[PDB]
């Protein structure tokens, strides 16, 4: 159980089932002109991530704002 933000919207949300946040960011094809993509979340445990893909991932509730 905790407390999130979640893309795409931006919000926060009960996951019973989670244990940690994570705020992940990678560039797609419009990274140049648009910026990172960033993707909010809530899991059982960190997320496994790929080359490209970075990540932060925090166990207190709303530890994944939006970055600034």
């Keep these: 159980m905790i407390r999130c933000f979640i893309t795409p ?6 996951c019973p089932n989670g244990h940690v ?5 990678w560039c ?3 990274c ?8 909010l979340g809530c899991a059982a445990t960190c997320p ?3 080359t490209g893909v970075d990540i932060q991932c925090c166990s207190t509730d709303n530890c994944n704002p939006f970055p600034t």
């Design 9 to 14: 919207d931006i919000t926060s949300k009960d």
């Design 21 to 25: 946040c994570y705020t992940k960011t």
């Design 28 to 30: 797609d094809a419009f």
């Design 32 to 39: 140049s002109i648009r910026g990172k993509r960033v993707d």
């Design 48 to 50: 496994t991530v790929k």
